[PDB]
Amino acid sequence: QKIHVGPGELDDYYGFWSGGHQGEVRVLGVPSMRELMRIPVFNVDSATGWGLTNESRHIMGDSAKFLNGDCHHPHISMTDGKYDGKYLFINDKANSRVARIRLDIMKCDKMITVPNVQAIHGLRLQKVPHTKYVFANAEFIIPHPNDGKVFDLQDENSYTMYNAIDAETMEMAFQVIVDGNLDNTDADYTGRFAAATCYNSEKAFDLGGMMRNERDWVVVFDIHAVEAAVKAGDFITLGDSKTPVLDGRKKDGKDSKFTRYVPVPKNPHGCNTSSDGKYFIAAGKLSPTCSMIAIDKLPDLFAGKLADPRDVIVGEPELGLGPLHTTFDGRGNAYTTLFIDSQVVKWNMEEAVRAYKGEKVNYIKQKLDVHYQPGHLHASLCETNEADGKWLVALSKFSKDRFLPVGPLHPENDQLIDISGDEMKLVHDGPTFAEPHDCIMARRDQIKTKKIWDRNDPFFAPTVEMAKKDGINLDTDNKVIRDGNKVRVYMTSMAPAFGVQEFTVKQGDEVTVTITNIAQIEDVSYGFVVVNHGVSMEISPQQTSSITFVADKPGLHWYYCSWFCHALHMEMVGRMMVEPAWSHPQ
Amino acid sequence: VKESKQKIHVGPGELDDYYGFWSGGHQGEVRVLGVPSMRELMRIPVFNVDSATGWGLTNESRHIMGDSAKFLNGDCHHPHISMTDGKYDGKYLFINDKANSRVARIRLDIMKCDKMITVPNVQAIHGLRLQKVPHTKYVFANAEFIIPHPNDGKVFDLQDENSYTMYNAIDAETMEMAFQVIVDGNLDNTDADYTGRFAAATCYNSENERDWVVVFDIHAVEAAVKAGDFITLGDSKTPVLDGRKKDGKDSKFTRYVPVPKNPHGCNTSSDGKYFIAAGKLSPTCSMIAIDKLPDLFAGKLADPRDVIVGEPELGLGPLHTTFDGRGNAYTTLFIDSQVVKWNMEEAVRAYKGEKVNYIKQKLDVHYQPGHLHASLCETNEADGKWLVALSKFSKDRFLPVGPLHPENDQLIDISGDEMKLVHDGPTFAEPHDCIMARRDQIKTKKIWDRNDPFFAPTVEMAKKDGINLDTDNKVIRDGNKVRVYMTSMAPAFGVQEFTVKQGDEVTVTITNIAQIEDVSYGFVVVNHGVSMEISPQQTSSITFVADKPGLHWYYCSWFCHALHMEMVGRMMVEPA
Numbered sequence A: 001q002k003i004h005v006g007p008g009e010l011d012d013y014y015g016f017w018s019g020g021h022q023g024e025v026r027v028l029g030v031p032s033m034r035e036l037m038r039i040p041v042f043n044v045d046s047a048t049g050w051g052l053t054n055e056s057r058h059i060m061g062d063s064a065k066f067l068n069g070d071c072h073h074p075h076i077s078m079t080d081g082k083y084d085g086k087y088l089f090i091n092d093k094a095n096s097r098v099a100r101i102r103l104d105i106m107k108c109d110k111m112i113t114v115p116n117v118q119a120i121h122g123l124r125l126q127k128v129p130h131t132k133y134v135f136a137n138a139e140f141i142i143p144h145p146n147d148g149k150v151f152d153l154q155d156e157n158s159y160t161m162y163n164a165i166d167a168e169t170m171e172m173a174f175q176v177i178v179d180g181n182l183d184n185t186d187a188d189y190t191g192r193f194a195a196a197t198c199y200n201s202e203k204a205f206d207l208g209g210m211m212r213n214e215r216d217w218v219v220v221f222d223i224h225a226v227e228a229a230v231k232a233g234d235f236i237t238l239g240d241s242k243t244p245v246l247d248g249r250k251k252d253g254k255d256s257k258f259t260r261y262v263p264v265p266k267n268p269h270g271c272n273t274s275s276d277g278k279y280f281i282a283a284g285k286l287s288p289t290c291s292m293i294a295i296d297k298l299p300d301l302f303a304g305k306l307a308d309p310r311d312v313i314v315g316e317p318e319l320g321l322g323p324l325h326t327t328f329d330g331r332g333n334a335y336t337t338l339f340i341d342s343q344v345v346k347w348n349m350e351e352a353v354r355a356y357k358g359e360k361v362n363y364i365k366q367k368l369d370v371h372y373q374p375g376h377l378h379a380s381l382c383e384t385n386e387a388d389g390k391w392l393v394a395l396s397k398f399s400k401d402r403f404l405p406v407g408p409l410h411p412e413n414d415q416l417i418d419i420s421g422d423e424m425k426l427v428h429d430g431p432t433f434a435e436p437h438d439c440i441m442a443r444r445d446q447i448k449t450k451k452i453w454d455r456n457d458p459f460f461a462p463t464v465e466m467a468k469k470d471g472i473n474l475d476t477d478n479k480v481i482r483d484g485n486k487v488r489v490y491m492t493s494m495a496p497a498f499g500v501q502e503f504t505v506k507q508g509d510e511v512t513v514t515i516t517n518i519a520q521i522e523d524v525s526y527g528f529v530v531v532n533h534g535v536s537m538e539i540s541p542q543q544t545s546s547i548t549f550v551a552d553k554p555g556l557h558w559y560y561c562s563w564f565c566h567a568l569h570m571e572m573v574g575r576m577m578v579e580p581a582w583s584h585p586q
Numbered sequence B: 001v002k003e004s005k006q007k008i009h010v011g012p013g014e015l016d017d018y019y020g021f022w023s024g025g026h027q028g029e030v031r032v033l034g035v036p037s038m039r040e041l042m043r044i045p046v047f048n049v050d051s052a053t054g055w056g057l058t059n060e061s062r063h064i065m066g067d068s069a070k071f072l073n074g075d076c077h078h079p080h081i082s083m084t085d086g087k088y089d090g091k092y093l094f095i096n097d098k099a100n101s102r103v104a105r106i107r108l109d110i111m112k113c114d115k116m117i118t119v120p121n122v123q124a125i126h127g128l129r130l131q132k133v134p135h136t137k138y139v140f141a142n143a144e145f146i147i148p149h150p151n152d153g154k155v156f157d158l159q160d161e162n163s164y165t166m167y168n169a170i171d172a173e174t175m176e177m178a179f180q181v182i183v184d185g186n187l188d189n190t191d192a193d194y195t196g197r198f199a200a201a202t203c204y205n206s207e208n209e210r211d212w213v214v215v216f217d218i219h220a221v222e223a224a225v226k227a228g229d230f231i232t233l234g235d236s237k238t239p240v241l242d243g244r245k246k247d248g249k250d251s252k253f254t255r256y257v258p259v260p261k262n263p264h265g266c267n268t269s270s271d272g273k274y275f276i277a278a279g280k281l282s283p284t285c286s287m288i289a290i291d292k293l294p295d296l297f298a299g300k301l302a303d304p305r306d307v308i309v310g311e312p313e314l315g316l317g318p319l320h321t322t323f324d325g326r327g328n329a330y331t332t333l334f335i336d337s338q339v340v341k342w343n344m345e346e347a348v349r350a351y352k353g354e355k356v357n358y359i360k361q362k363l364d365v366h367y368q369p370g371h372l373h374a375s376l377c378e379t380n381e382a383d384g385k386w387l388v389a390l391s392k393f394s395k396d397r398f399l400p401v402g403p404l405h406p407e408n409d410q411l412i413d414i415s416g417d418e419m420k421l422v423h424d425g426p427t428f429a430e431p432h433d434c435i436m437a438r439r440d441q442i443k444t445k446k447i448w449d450r451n452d453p454f455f456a457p458t459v460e461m462a463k464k465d466g467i468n469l470d471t472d473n474k475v476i477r478d479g480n481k482v483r484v485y486m487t488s489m490a491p492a493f494g495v496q497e498f499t500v501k502q503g504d505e506v507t508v509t510i511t512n513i514a515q516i517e518d519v520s521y522g523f524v525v526v527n528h529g530v531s532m533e534i535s536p537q538q539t540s541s542i543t544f545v546a547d548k549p550g551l552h553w554y555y556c557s558w559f560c561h562a563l564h565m566e567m568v569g570r571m572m573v574e575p576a
């Protein structure tokens, strides 16, 4: 298995890394582990203008007021349990958002603030028959309504909710109230069942209380029952949201139609579907085990053919101190991170199941040391029924002495491990910034990217619509439109000349600059910067971009093209002239 | 005979040999790489807003940025490291902001931006370089674009006698302006000699069959400043000297050396003999003899062209030059898409008419190189081991990732007689230029000092409230202001709940009293756009308004402990 990608060689896999609390998505080549691209999502990106431009702020909605995000879990849309390469979804824990990235243009094209919740943490996609739903955990219990009259998490109206988002429209589909709280989640290989771990079955707010119970649980959702209740109109709404809300709590011991609670020790964390579709595997964290939920026993559990919810557990292997996450090679082994022991442990799921039935046997195959304190791990295609068992990335939280010193803040250490053989082999230490939690890999042929924009692309269609009201054809017009104290500049661009090289406004005017890059070549991107106005954006081939700012300073102000595009790059410039307020009315 | 055969694989457990400091380009940060692995070890926020650490959101960072904290963007190109006696001393890194006309200082012991200045009365700081000898007293900075003076909207004509740009000197230690020099034309790039007397800059817009490199007599400038012979502009107290030619007469502070053609790069050879100006539109470099500049300013030379001692023909589109310390220069050919290696002394002899070939090798790069940088090339210790060429079009060299492409930063072994390309490093947002330093030239703190200037103003606020940041967990109420102070020790915030009134302006100050390297904590307030880092022994603070009634969770964002998920707290906001 080639480990090094020489000059002129291409990587075999795409890797999509979460940005952690830096808020972006990063695109890596695997196995070289080099960063090919950054995709801004919840961060403000100076280079492309994401969070400054009118297109990006329209996608972010009211949340464009936040300059931060915290993402953990990137996942790729699937058709029949295999990646189809259309979309990447990722969570925002800091401002309770889910974002969709369009993998053909590698940009965030949709974003939603999940109503009536705080902190979207766990996120995963339906696998079968395709990704109809994005499943998203809200982590923290809050009052409903949260109007400041009740603060107690033990009140009957204090709770958190499981969230399903329509992948294609990126509108809420439903929400399910649960007991306890929600950590990570996964889905089965039929479309019926999803599952989430809970660590706060105590509904406490202090550390001691959140650890009291010997077992919390994984809550299992019967999505068919949920949809059936929705189509039946048997749901409520909260506040101003029209999202159907269903009640998944126990009510005096009796289970909801929508949920079952499997007792699992202890403050469990990871929740991973095996690539063969047999198991939900929950990482015990404070318990030195994983718990294996048999998905094929779930219909019986929901029909009361089982006497005890624990009867869906068919294994609970002892793996080591602080199991956090599990991934799969597709050969019948699971790999689990041990945060405290700082290892990855390879174990055989079928043997662990036999040992739970008393058949004494050694299901642990190998323990590999990692550096240090691993969180997530990801084996190539592990989330599909094409799990290929080639590469394994383990994302550790303390790199200590593994890289040159760079001050008090250290990088993370994302370590690439060869699992194609019987023995795991550590091959590469990859330092990353801001704590990626999780990543996801796709084969090179599973991702198809556009090199030039289509002119009808929904990303800037609202801008095309604005132009039409001014009688503007964006493909050819270089025009300055005036409307009271607003000025709308429309221009084409072809290196090294802006189509409007100068224009004049009154001090205080609100200026929108719309630029259409009418180039038809690849890698031919232009920029636009207005000096000393905090204005910056990218316009790639056939794209239209626009940015709005206030001409608050009298005098002559230069604008320039930022993206090196030509041998005459530092000469693709223009001038905005701002007439002083004292020479105009008022 | 000596071969180029350095090892590029830094396996697990092994450490890189050099630090690389990459500019962030249009993204606005600075990036720290290990060389030769070319892996990114750290990002240093400067002009960007960084969700992870809170740079741009915290009180400490917005204090450093001053009024310019209102800008969420930057555009940097030129990172440089402070020198003592012509050698890197590891103290500071400086970098430019072309978009909002700033210079930033980074302290290399903490790897944080600690000072920032908006340069007055100019637009767009582009070229930037450091005084070398006797140390980096001055940061030299080019303002690129010509503007009216004053720029109040009465005059827009760029040919007006009061429309010009200026060369800028910033005091490196105080990060206050030292002086500005009005010049003719446009400034592009700049460098300094190895004595402290001279600096030089290419000018592309003298408007021209020839533009020039302008040469500054920094001693003469300092003399005038100390005798009070200067004017000031607008409301800036900065001494301003007039370096323009007047009726064909020369300023005391400047000489204009004719050089073709829209010259771009301006690079000082490591032996200190030459300012080398890359020809861009002319397929040449021009070599100015620094030891002839005293005679130039003394009026002992018949013609400003007399200080030119070499003009080698290299290829199409020379943009920049670097040095191996063995007597070779390395120049990027932007059109030919090559690095050309050439011998500077053979170039000088050729210029006299000897038939001697000074070109040693041309290496193909991919594609369209701009800047290049050999290790320690800006110092008299240039070691001739590694070369990075930063190329603007990666085309097919990496997997496709949509309409936007990465820059291709190519690592080249120059240790032997033949350059060898050994690695392609894709980078985001056109870093443009970089600088390398030996591992042993950089010394960083592992934990913060409690007296650090970075958060000294926050320590002062706490002093006014009577707070001992090392021990106290308290909530001060002051009208509609709320100042929460707390220690933190994973897995617990030192204040786990507090209550305020809707609309209160809340300041949260957190001190990480851990003593263990790498145990960094975070603080995020859910749905309030609040996020910051607190590393060991650091104090950080952030102000926001509690505009939403009800219970609002905060949590630690830096995975710090087995019980990370449970290190949380509650803000309770009583309705108005």
Ligand code: CUZ
Binding pocket: A072, A073, A121, A269, A270, A324, A325, A375, A376, A437, A438
């Ligand atoms: Cu948010 S948690 Cu184990 Cu995913 Cu990092």
Ligand code: CUA
Binding pocket: A495, A496, A526, A527, A561, A562, A563, A564, A565, A566, A568, A569, A570, A572
């Ligand atoms: Cu247009 Cu560079």
Ligand code: CUA
Binding pocket: B490, B491, B520, B521, B522, B556, B557, B558, B559, B560, B561, B563, B564, B565, B567
């Ligand atoms: Cu504090 Cu994780």
Ligand SMILES: [Ca+2]
Binding pocket: A199, A200, A201, A202, A209, A210, A211, A212, A213, A215, A216, A266, A267
């Ligand atoms: Ca618990």
Ligand SMILES: [Ca+2]
Binding pocket: B204, B205, B206, B207, B208, B211, B262
């Ligand atoms: Ca010119």
Ligand SMILES: [Cl-]
Binding pocket: A184, A185, A269, A270, A271, A272, A325
């Ligand atoms: Cl998980």
Ligand SMILES: [Cl-]
Binding pocket: B189, B190, B264, B265, B266, B267, B320
């Ligand atoms: Cl230069």
Ligand SMILES: [K+]
Binding pocket: A397, A398, A399, A410, A411, A412, A435, B559
């Ligand atoms: K870390």
Ligand SMILES: [K+]
Binding pocket: B392, B393, B405, B406, B407, B430
């Ligand atoms: K580029």
Ligand code: NA
Binding pocket: A059, A061, A110, A111, A112, A170
């Ligand atoms: Na939306």
Ligand code: NA
Binding pocket: B064, B065, B066, B115, B116, B117, B118, B175
């Ligand atoms: Na300052």
Ligand SMILES: [Zn+2]
Binding pocket: B077, B078, B371, B432, B433
């Ligand atoms: Zn440059």
Ligand SMILES: [Zn+2]
Binding pocket: B264, B265, B319, B320, B370, B371
């Ligand atoms: Zn350049």
